[PDB]
């Protein structure tokens, strides 16, 4: 009888046990070592925290105290690495980056 | 070779990553909310990244004729899928998490 679940052991907020169960039930491999869910969960938490902080900064530079899909779209499309990672992904209700061609501008 | 009442029958009542995403948001932005649509977008993102990394790790294990998906396969999949600085920081976070996990 003890305590201190795997997420607390790894210093993670994401669920290591649920990730382990998804890996074991996902038909990915015959066996899953017990470092794979921890590594995975850490990587997923890092990506989630990165996009969440970028979207929070985007909301903070709008006088808004709540993240909407527009802020997530602005955070993703303004980072080339995140844009390349999600280049074939459509964010619902996220709009598009404001961009007008230089030729279209009048003078 | 024995069932013993068959406890395996668990019902997934539309389980998602919303609680953990909320915890991460409170960690990074203590005073900031998130709409339901944005949380659904983040849930879809987490599921997509999980599927991508798991599929890449499975293909890596199959190519090398290994039957086990270890943290090495996850690290190689992260290096393959994520771009440069993203992959480097993700590898650092995964290595730190695995080292903390296998130290107690």
């Amino acid at each position: 009888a003890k305590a201190k679940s795997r997420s607390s052991r790894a210093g993670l907020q994401f669920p290591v046990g649920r990730v382990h169960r998804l890996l074991r039930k996902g038909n990915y491999a015959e066996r899953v070592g017990a470092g794979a869910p921890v590594y995975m969960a850490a990587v997923l938490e890092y990506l989630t925290a990165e996009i969440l902080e970028l979207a929070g900064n985007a909301a903070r530079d709008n006088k808004k105290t709540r993240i909407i899909p527009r802020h997530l779209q602005l955070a993703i499309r303004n980072d080339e690495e995140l844009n390349k990672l999600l280049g074939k992904v459509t964010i619902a209700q996220g709009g598009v980056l404001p961009n007008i061609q230089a030729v279209l501008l009048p003078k | 070779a024995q069932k013993k009442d068959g406890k395996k029958r668990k019902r997934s009542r539309k389980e998602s990553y919303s609680i953990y995403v909320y915890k991460v948001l409170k960690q990074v932005h203590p005073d900031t909310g998130i709409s339901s649509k944005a949380m659904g977008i983040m849930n879809s993102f987490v599921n997509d990244i999980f599927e991508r990394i798991a599929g890449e790790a499975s293909r890596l294990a199959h190519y090398n004729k290994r039957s086990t998906i270890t943290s090495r396969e996850i690290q190689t999949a992260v290096r393959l899928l994520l771009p440069g600085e993203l992959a480097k920081h993700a590898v650092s976070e995964g290595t730190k998490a695995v080292t903390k996990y296998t130290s107690s």
Epitope: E50, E53, L54, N78, D79, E80, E81 | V28, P83, G84, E85, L86, H89
Partner: single-chain antibody, 226 residues
Framework: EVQLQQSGPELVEPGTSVKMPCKAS????????IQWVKQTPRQGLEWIGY????????KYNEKFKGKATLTSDKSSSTVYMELSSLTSEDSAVYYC?????????????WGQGTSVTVSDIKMTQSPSSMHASLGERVTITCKAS??????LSWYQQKPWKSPKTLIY???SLADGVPSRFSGSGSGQDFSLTINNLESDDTATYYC?????????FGSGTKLEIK
């Protein structure tokens, strides 16, 4: 591999304008922002601003708004910094550094720096001057004004040399840095520890926070051994 080439020393007169390049090579030019900082003996290092060449997105320090303008040329992979109306207090060493778009990353590679001579969160480093033998234990502290969540970096700078990254994210070793240096702390209290002092550990050590919009450097600590 990764290099940030700059120009020579500029001699200028008051009221003139100066343009300096930051020609970069060895990496994907659009994937890393170029930051500009200025160094004077009076108040040490100061963060001027940065430009992201991927979308040409700039952001300047509040006290440097208007005085400094940043531009990018993707075809030649170069960054230009322009200073207009150079007053008396502009003769300094201007450095351009690379920094990834990731919030955890810091200024990893610095240019040689151009010496131009004209004819909020506060960072506190406790030990201004320091002495040590060739094998002793040493430590410096960079207690911050507000709360920064581990977005602290430690740099070492030889005299008349560009600063070199030692620690990023307050605990991580920079690329190529030995394990002798050790970063620790978080929140508002941080520390950089040196295991044993070699002859190469004679330099000025600075701490930089990039948690809030205006990046602020520390006062700096001068460490000469024996």
């Amino acid at each position: 591999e990764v290099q940030l080439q700059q120009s020579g020393p500029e001699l200028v007169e008051p009221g003139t304008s100066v343009k300096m390049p930051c020609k970069a090579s060895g990496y994907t030019f659009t994937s890393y922002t170029i930051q500009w900082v200025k160094q004077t003996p009076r108040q040490g290092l100061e963060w001027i601003g940065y430009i992201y060449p991927y979308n040409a997105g700039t952001k300047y320090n509040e006290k440097f708004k208007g005085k400094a303008t940043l531009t990018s040329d993707k075809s030649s992979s170069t960054v230009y910094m322009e200073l207009s109306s150079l007053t008396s207090e502009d003769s300094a060493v201007y450095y351009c550094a690379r920094k990834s778009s990731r919030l955890r990353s810091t200024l990893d590679y610095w240019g040689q720096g151009t010496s131009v001579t004209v004819s909020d969160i506060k960072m506190t480093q406790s030990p201004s001057s320091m002495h040590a033998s060739l094998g002793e234990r040493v430590t410096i502290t960079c207690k911050a004004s507000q709360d920064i969540r581990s977005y602290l970096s430690w740099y070492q700078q030889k005299p008349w040399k560009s600063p070199k990254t030692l620690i990023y994210y307050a605990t991580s070793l920079a690329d190529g840095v030995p394990s002798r240096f050790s970063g620790s702390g978080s929140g508002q209290d941080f520390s950089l520890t040196i295991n044993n002092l070699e002859s190469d550990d004679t330099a000025t050590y600075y701490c930089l926070q990039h948690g809030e919009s205006p990046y602020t450097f520390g006062s700096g600590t001068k460490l000469e051994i024996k």
